[PDB]
Amino acid sequence: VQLVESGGGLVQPGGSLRLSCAASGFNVYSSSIHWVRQAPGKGLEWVASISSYYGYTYYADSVKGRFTISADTSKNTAYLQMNSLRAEDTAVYYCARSRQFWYSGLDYWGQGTLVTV
Amino acid sequence: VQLVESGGGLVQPGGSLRLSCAASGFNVYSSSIHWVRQAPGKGLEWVASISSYYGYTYYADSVKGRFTISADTSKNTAYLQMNSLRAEDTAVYYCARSRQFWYSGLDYWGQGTLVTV
Amino acid sequence: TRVFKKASPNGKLTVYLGKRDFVDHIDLVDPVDGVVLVDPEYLKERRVYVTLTCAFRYGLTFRKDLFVANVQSFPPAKPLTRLQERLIKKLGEHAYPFTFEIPPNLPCSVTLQPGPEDTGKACGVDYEVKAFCAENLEEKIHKRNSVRLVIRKVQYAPERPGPQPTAETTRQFLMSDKPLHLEASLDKEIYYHGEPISVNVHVTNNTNKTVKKIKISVRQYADICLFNTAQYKCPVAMEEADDTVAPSSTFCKVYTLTPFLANNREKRGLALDGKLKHEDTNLASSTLLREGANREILGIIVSYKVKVKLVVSRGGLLGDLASSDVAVELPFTLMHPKPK
Amino acid sequence: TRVFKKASPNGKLTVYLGKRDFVDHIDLVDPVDGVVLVDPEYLKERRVYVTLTCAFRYGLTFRKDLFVANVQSFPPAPEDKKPLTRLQERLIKKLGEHAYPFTFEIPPNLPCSVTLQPGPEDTGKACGVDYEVKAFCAENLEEKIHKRNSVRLVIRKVQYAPERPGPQPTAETTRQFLMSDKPLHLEASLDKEIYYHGEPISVNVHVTNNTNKTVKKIKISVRQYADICLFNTAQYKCPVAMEEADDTVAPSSTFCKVYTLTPFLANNREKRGLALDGKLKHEDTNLASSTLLREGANREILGIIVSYKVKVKLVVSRGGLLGDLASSDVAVELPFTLMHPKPK
Amino acid sequence: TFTPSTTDTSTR
Amino acid sequence: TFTPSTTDTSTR
Amino acid sequence: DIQMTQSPSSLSASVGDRVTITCRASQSVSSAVAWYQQKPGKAPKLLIYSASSLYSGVPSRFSGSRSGTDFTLTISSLQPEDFATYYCQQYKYVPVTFGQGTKVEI
Amino acid sequence: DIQMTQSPSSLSASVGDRVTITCRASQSVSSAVAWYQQKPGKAPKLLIYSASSLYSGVPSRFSGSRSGTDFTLTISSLQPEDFATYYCQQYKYVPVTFGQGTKVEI
């Protein structure tokens, strides 16, 4: 029961990335997968959430339209497509897991990947 | 479990008599009801039998046509219609019971009614 | 102290069976044992085989074998039953044993009642112990050399009575605030053949509607599975009562029913107990299965229920979109008591 | 340590409920207790009654009440004299002299809160079974309820997964064909009998094709059975998960595989009449939990009864003369329990 | 010349 | 002027 | 029909004596043979069925045996209450035929 | 959105000292409040959910309490491993908003 994320790197402003979160030890339909970024020296900020049981995706107002969260339910993996990136989007992006029934905090976190813009 | 009879009496040759067997303590469909006459000073002789489960009646060759055995399954009572009686038909008529599943002798007998003719 | 004996048409083969009815105890079946009497002078290097076959016949004529067991009795290749040892002692050196083991989850001997249209052979499941002498198993079985004995696989009523079968339903109607309640029950769960069945019916009519009739029937369910799944329904007993329950009134009555074969002789496909040749056998006994197996068996599966149906008066603003038949079903066991 | 509080539109009536979900344990249901804060100065001569109602709502609008319980909280009625729970004692101590308790006992054999999913063309209320705790101010019980005086709180009757796992659900069937001397055997089983919402279901299938016929396809489906009984008896079928596998079993050959299925609401949102767990107002609830009945009762209950089964269906090729006359659909159903774990 | 039907015999 | 919805309160 | 030739027609024995009553079937009636006791003026009483099985309640001194088509009723000890006419019935084939009875006296 | 105001921005304490961290919600988020600690360079770690429920595994010295819209994180004894940045989450409404963190040093 642990989460692995990978795909962060230096990208010019206006570029695009795809952050993948290899979830293992739990099912995509009994859990909700969330992305929480943290700018260097700043606090936690939630950007995107996906619920595969209900087929619903939520985004922050800052990343609405630009970002897209997906889930590959076949292999228990979630993706964050950060299109039209900006300089203020540089942060450490964490992939977190919460219970689907029911949300009781982000109990499992990934190690975090740095996305530099 | 008891068998009681009624209907034996003096009749003239060529007359008709009806013998009843008020069966109590057992069911007409789990039992078979038999009539066994016995001429005075002689041995037992089976005359008629009825199986209400199968709806089959059997008669002896001496009483075929003349005699008729019936059952009132509602009242748990069997009847023997002794039509076209003859002088040789004088006897003590016994009503007996046998198991329907399966025949293991006439375990229960009535007290017997004399039919004089 | 006694055994069955049948001989070959030529008299050179005799098979001895201790019984013709073998009891299935769900967990295990009574083993078919016996002794076959041979004469090697007649055989002249042939071998005597004994076969146990469970077949689903039609008497179309869709005859299929559900279980075949073959044993070479002579020449000899199981420990001897005391009966087999005693038979060997009685007969001599030329008597040889055979023993069969019927695997569980096999059908019991069930005969389906033929319709008046056809007068052919019996349709259903039957077992046969066949003893024959031949050089090899691939050779056809000859009539002069073979002996066929029909045996039956039977089940008896469970010793411990089961829970009392109870059922209750309730209906709500558009123009009545309170519901119509129906309660039915039987005095016992295991019944014997020919014995009556008492149905205790309690109707609590709190609706504006009255029930016109209370139809109570005993129905036999035969689950026949050879090529398809097919459950067949046959009411073996009925009682159409004119008992009326007034609106805002309750009713309690006890009804007595007895299923028997005299009035059911015109119902084609009605399951009967296995026959030996053509004798009258009562209605088929309920087949006892494992508690929970959810397993379907190639053969005929017989079960009985009592259906208590209320006929509620029609009409009302809602119309025909309501229950005119409020029914419950009571599963019971119809079997034979264990002998002795 | 915290209770629910809802007030009347005029503010003169307040209902204190410790819970909104009351667990049914088959044998008994959690008691619905609470405290009602009254204002006798405003409440000149009237009385405060609290009502518990279980209703089968619209679905034109066929609303019927399955269970109604009514209690007079102010003035304290000697008939409704029950010992106070610790929650009610704490609430009365917090509130004061004008706090009065009510207590309801939900009898068994009553439906759980189940909502049927509305169709695309439906625009009415929510079809299903609902519970409601309503407190109102009225002089008598034959007077209509007023919107300004009454407080309505929706509560739910819920059931959680049994603590002890049940027997493994196994089932098998056998078919005999005309030209085939040996039969076709199908065995299916599930890894467990109690599943949770969102948890995958593993179906272990064993096919022993000893016949001359080929199993073309194996269809694995999870189906939901809703037994709805208000005016008639009707069982509704709804496949919540499916798996059409192209696995072929050759004649005189065997085949064993394990299939994984997960029922969820994302792909079942277009299925009208699909049973869902009770909603409070309109929130998104999962598929309906399996209802836990008595072991053996043969009892038909007003409301909605939800059960789940996995159907393993084999598709057999049609041919080889013999005039067909075969099922060609060798199906097996395995009943399992789809519930929520008891909260820790 | 008929087919030998089933009979019984004492096991002694 | 809207209908008072459901809220919580500490039991102390 | 089938004739049940019962012998002897009557025998005399003392108290404690062994009494053997023999029944012969004209045809093969299998074990389907019953034995009855009928005291004068009363109904017959079932003693044996299936030619060897003692009916419930009958004293153990009554025993039945079969040898092919020969059936025998044996009384090990003859208590004074055992003096009656004993009948032999076969119930293998309709019509049911009885024996001629065997009166047992002092 | 809902502003999750947290105070103090940072605090200092010794070993065994009692530390209280308070988070204030702009609106009524009910009890749907979680608490995390994030040591520098590592992922955040859930401490308390539902504003009072201690997570499975986290030591008992951590305790959460609420008072209306005021949520407090209390550390009874400050172990040497308890010096991190503590964040308050509300998950009652989307979007989810966190606190600004409370760095705890020696």
PDB file of N, CA, C and O in Angstrom, chain C residues 1-2 100 112 125 138 143 145 194 208 247 295 298 304 317 320 334:
ATOM      1  N   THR C   1     -30.794 -62.127   5.765  1.00  0.00           N
ATOM      2  CA  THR C   1     -31.078 -63.557   5.770  1.00  0.00           C
ATOM      3  C   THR C   1     -31.664 -64.017   4.442  1.00  0.00           C
ATOM      4  O   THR C   1     -32.040 -65.177   4.294  1.00  0.00           O
ATOM      5  N   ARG C   2     -31.838 -63.098   3.509  1.00  0.00           N
ATOM      6  CA  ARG C   2     -32.308 -63.529   2.171  1.00  0.00           C
ATOM      7  C   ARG C   2     -31.737 -62.586   1.130  1.00  0.00           C
ATOM      8  O   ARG C   2     -31.506 -61.412   1.440  1.00  0.00           O
ATOM      9  N   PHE C 100     -19.964 -52.113  -6.139  1.00  0.00           N
ATOM     10  CA  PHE C 100     -20.058 -50.813  -6.781  1.00  0.00           C
ATOM     11  C   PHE C 100     -20.189 -49.727  -5.726  1.00  0.00           C
ATOM     12  O   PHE C 100     -20.678 -49.968  -4.619  1.00  0.00           O
ATOM     13  N   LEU C 112     -41.460 -40.451 -14.462  1.00  0.00           N
ATOM     14  CA  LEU C 112     -42.443 -39.450 -14.849  1.00  0.00           C
ATOM     15  C   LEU C 112     -43.677 -40.152 -15.396  1.00  0.00           C
ATOM     16  O   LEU C 112     -43.566 -41.057 -16.228  1.00  0.00           O
ATOM     17  N   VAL C 125     -35.301 -41.571 -14.475  1.00  0.00           N
ATOM     18  CA  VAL C 125     -33.991 -42.052 -14.056  1.00  0.00           C
ATOM     19  C   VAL C 125     -34.157 -43.420 -13.415  1.00  0.00           C
ATOM     20  O   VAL C 125     -35.020 -43.609 -12.549  1.00  0.00           O
ATOM     21  N   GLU C 138     -15.359 -54.318 -25.321  1.00  0.00           N
ATOM     22  CA  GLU C 138     -15.806 -53.745 -26.585  1.00  0.00           C
ATOM     23  C   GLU C 138     -16.840 -54.617 -27.282  1.00  0.00           C
ATOM     24  O   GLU C 138     -17.588 -54.115 -28.126  1.00  0.00           O
ATOM     25  N   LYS C 143     -27.921 -61.487 -25.118  1.00  0.00           N
ATOM     26  CA  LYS C 143     -29.080 -61.701 -24.255  1.00  0.00           C
ATOM     27  C   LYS C 143     -28.991 -63.030 -23.518  1.00  0.00           C
ATOM     28  O   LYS C 143     -29.382 -63.124 -22.349  1.00  0.00           O
ATOM     29  N   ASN C 145     -26.366 -64.516 -22.502  1.00  0.00           N
ATOM     30  CA  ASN C 145     -25.259 -64.505 -21.558  1.00  0.00           C
ATOM     31  C   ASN C 145     -25.415 -63.487 -20.438  1.00  0.00           C
ATOM     32  O   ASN C 145     -24.620 -63.512 -19.494  1.00  0.00           O
ATOM     33  N   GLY C 194     -49.341 -40.129   1.857  1.00  0.00           N
ATOM     34  CA  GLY C 194     -50.674 -40.457   2.294  1.00  0.00           C
ATOM     35  C   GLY C 194     -51.135 -39.733   3.540  1.00  0.00           C
ATOM     36  O   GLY C 194     -52.333 -39.747   3.840  1.00  0.00           O
ATOM     37  N   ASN C 208     -59.517  -1.571   2.337  1.00  0.00           N
ATOM     38  CA  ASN C 208     -60.899  -1.415   1.904  1.00  0.00           C
ATOM     39  C   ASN C 208     -61.367  -2.576   1.041  1.00  0.00           C
ATOM     40  O   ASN C 208     -62.570  -2.688   0.780  1.00  0.00           O
ATOM     41  N   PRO C 247     -63.558  -6.335   4.704  1.00  0.00           N
ATOM     42  CA  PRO C 247     -62.644  -5.215   4.952  1.00  0.00           C
ATOM     43  C   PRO C 247     -62.621  -4.846   6.426  1.00  0.00           C
ATOM     44  O   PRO C 247     -63.645  -4.885   7.111  1.00  0.00           O
ATOM     45  N   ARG C 295     -25.771 -26.525  -6.546  1.00  0.00           N
ATOM     46  CA  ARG C 295     -25.310 -27.452  -7.570  1.00  0.00           C
ATOM     47  C   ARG C 295     -26.501 -27.998  -8.343  1.00  0.00           C
ATOM     48  O   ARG C 295     -27.501 -28.405  -7.743  1.00  0.00           O
ATOM     49  N   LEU C 298     -27.679 -33.466 -13.271  1.00  0.00           N
ATOM     50  CA  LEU C 298     -28.284 -34.117 -14.426  1.00  0.00           C
ATOM     51  C   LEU C 298     -29.266 -35.181 -13.954  1.00  0.00           C
ATOM     52  O   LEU C 298     -28.847 -36.211 -13.423  1.00  0.00           O
ATOM     53  N   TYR C 304     -41.647 -30.115  -3.148  1.00  0.00           N
ATOM     54  CA  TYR C 304     -43.056 -29.820  -2.931  1.00  0.00           C
ATOM     55  C   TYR C 304     -43.208 -28.509  -2.178  1.00  0.00           C
ATOM     56  O   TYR C 304     -42.392 -28.180  -1.315  1.00  0.00           O
ATOM     57  N   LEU C 317     -60.000   2.976  -7.944  1.00  0.00           N
ATOM     58  CA  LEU C 317     -59.514   4.013  -8.849  1.00  0.00           C
ATOM     59  C   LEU C 317     -58.218   3.589  -9.530  1.00  0.00           C
ATOM     60  O   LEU C 317     -58.014   3.868 -10.717  1.00  0.00           O
ATOM     61  N   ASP C 320     -56.289  -2.162 -12.467  1.00  0.00           N
ATOM     62  CA  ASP C 320     -55.658  -3.468 -12.609  1.00  0.00           C
ATOM     63  C   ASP C 320     -54.173  -3.458 -12.274  1.00  0.00           C
ATOM     64  O   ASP C 320     -53.517  -4.494 -12.416  1.00  0.00           O
ATOM     65  N   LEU C 334     -41.888 -34.255   1.455  1.00  0.00           N
ATOM     66  CA  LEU C 334     -42.767 -35.410   1.290  1.00  0.00           C
ATOM     67  C   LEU C 334     -41.894 -36.633   1.042  1.00  0.00           C
ATOM     68  O   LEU C 334     -41.308 -36.771  -0.036  1.00  0.00           O
TER      69      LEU C 334
END
